Amino acid sequence: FITANSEYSESSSFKNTETEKSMYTSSRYLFPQGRIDFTTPDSGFDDV
Amino acid sequence: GDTLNDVIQDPTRRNKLINDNNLLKGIIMGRDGPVPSS
């Protein structure tokens, strides 16, 4: 004499992305010409 | 096409070569490495 029905459907979804980037550049141009010296009294040299 | 001969025969060029290369100066062998003497 009677019929009954029930349904229950549940769903879940999840996504997660993490991105990291890093860059570094170092340039050095070294163009020497020479060296200059001064004489300290402890050296004992006549040019002081 | 000059060579070392043309440099050496000219006193100005010969002395420029000697001076710019520290050819009259010894080398200090320090613990940090060799350095030309003044």
Automatic annotation (TrEMBL), chain A:
It comes from the Eukaryota. This is Pleurotolysin B. The gene is plyB. The chain holds residues 138 to 185 of 523 of the full protein.
